[PDB]
Design a protein around this ligand. Structure first.
Ligand code: HEM
Ligand SMILES: CC(=O)N1CCN(c2ccc(OC[C@@H]3CO[C@@](Cn4ccnc4)(c4ccc(Cl)cc4Cl)O3)cc2)CC1
Length: 397
């Protein structure tokens, strides 16, 4: 233990993981050189995420401009979070998600049908599939944009190191503002003539007198669109990667496609698309007996918690057959901010992997030109994943 910050960056995962392990052991609550605090143990990550009074999700809590963006449900605390969550959950329903299955399968099947035997999984499927699905769910037209989220890439590639930096707020707003404005216009068109698409549902939604204005509906639809440009794109790459490291599971899921949901849960634990979540202390508190001051940022390492042997047995072992006494998925968060889109992600990744197996039996990652381009910061995964099918319906005698 020395007072010289490293943090292996995300790009070297094995080194990140060895660091996390040692911190879990020796420094479970750590303050970095920017005065940002880090929480590494499973039970402590849980404490933090649950306790919204002490640990607020409003980053703008500190900054002199009390600007909580309306309808940014992940950046809003009780009691307003509660009423907001109720309004959106009433538009964004299981039924609404589940009816998507046939379209999810149609799109996935057509995109793969054209891929050849050697392609980029991200450009071919992992990116265009959720973009298409989420737009259609929201009731938007098909978009012209596609470079693996030109704007969503800019977002995750933000000029950032010190999260205390006030500029950062502006750099984010710079990217999102054009997109939020475009959605605000779409919401106003649906307010005029509502359909059954999700934007119409959002605009008509009302729970205990609380309705979304076009500000809030546009903001929240923007978040949803962003979720669809990034999350499945990262998870599905992580799934193929991991299965490529334990390839016996390709054959097992081919024989019993009902094993697929469990593969997805396991990769979620093993490689969470989002390894860290962020909170701000609203008051002097302590974690693990470590005193933390008011008004500072706190990062909760979901990646650490997931590899913490006190939470799981043999935690670095990739094992889909691991029954869990109360399978609750920390990679989708913990508490009242628990992932609203969890069913949709589970559905898209299940259908995706099903369709990969049905056409190809298996894919392997292709490192025959370069090593993978990992995300350097926000998410845990790769920007591209060139793959190779050994088998496919194209092969002839
Ligand atoms: C692999 C896929 C996904 C992962 C790992 C994931 C992860 C997460 C996590 C960790 C949180 C909690 C954030 C916090 O506590 O600060 C969260 C919240 C949220 N996610 Fe996701 N998500 C995924 C897919 C999606 C999708 C597809 C959508 C919507 C289309 C979505 C929408 C949301 C929303 C709206 C919330 C916040 C709910 C609230 O604040 O009450 N997610 N997600
Ligand atoms: C030092 C350093 O690099 N820090 C690392 C960790 N920091 C960080 C960590 C996590 C993070 O994710 C925040 C939030 C939490 O989850 C999401 C990502 N997301 C999207 C759908 N499901 C999850 C999100 C949830 C809900 C909604 Cl409506 C929109 C979004 Cl988008 O971003 C954003 C930034 C960034 C700075």
């Amino acid at each position: 233990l020395t007072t010289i910050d490293e943090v292996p960056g995300m790009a070297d995962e094995t080194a990140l993981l060895d660091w996390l392990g040692t911190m879990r052991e020796k420094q479970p609550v750590w303050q970095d050189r920017y005065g940002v605090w880090h929480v590494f143990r499973h039970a402590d990550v849980q404490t933090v995420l649950r306790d919204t009074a002490t640990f607020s999700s409003d980053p703008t809590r500190v900054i002199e401009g009390a600007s909580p963006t309306p309808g940014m449900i992940h950046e809003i605390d009780p009691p307003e979070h509660r009423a907001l969550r109720k309004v959106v959950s009433s538009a964004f329903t299981p039924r609404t998600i589940s009816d998507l299955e046939p379209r999810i399968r149609d799109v996935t099947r057509s995109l793969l049908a054209d891929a050849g035997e050697s392609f980029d999984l991200v450009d071919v499927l992992a990116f265009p599939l959720p973009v298409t699905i989420v737009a259609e769910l929201l009731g938007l037209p098909p978009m012209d944009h596609e470079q693996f989220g030109d704007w969503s890439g800019a977002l995750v590639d933000i000029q950032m190191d010190d999260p205390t930096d006030p500029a950062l707020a502006e750099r984010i707003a710079d990217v999102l503002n054009p997109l939020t404005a475009y959605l605000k216009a779409r919401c106003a068109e649906r307010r005029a003539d509502p359909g059954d698409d999700l934007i119409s549902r959002l605009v008509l939604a009302e729970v205990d007198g609380r309705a979304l204005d076009d500000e809030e509906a546009a903001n929240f639809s923007t978040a949803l669109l962003l979720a669809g440009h990034i999350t499945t794109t990262v998870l599905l790459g992580n799934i193929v990667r991991t299965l490529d490291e334990h390839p016996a599971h390709w054959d097992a899921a081919a024989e019993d496609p009902g094993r697929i949901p469990a593969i997805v849960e396991e990769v979620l634990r093993y490689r969470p698309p989002f390894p860290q979540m962020q909170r701000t202390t609203t008051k002097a508190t302590e974690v693990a007996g470590v005193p933390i001051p008011a008004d500072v940022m706190v990062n909760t390492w979901v990646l650490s918690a997931n590899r913490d042997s006190d939470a799981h047995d043999d935690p670095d072992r990739f094992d889909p057959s691991r029954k869990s006494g109360g399978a609750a998925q920390l990679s989708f968060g913990h508490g009242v901010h628990f992932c609203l889109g969890a069913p949709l992600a589970r559905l898209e990744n299940r259908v995706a992997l099903e369709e990969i197996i049905a056409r190809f039996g298996r894919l392997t990652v292709d490192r025959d030109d370069e090593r993978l381009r990992h995300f350097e910061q926000i998410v845990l995964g790769t920007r591209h994943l060139p793959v190779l099918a050994g088998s496919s319906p194209r092969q002839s005698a």
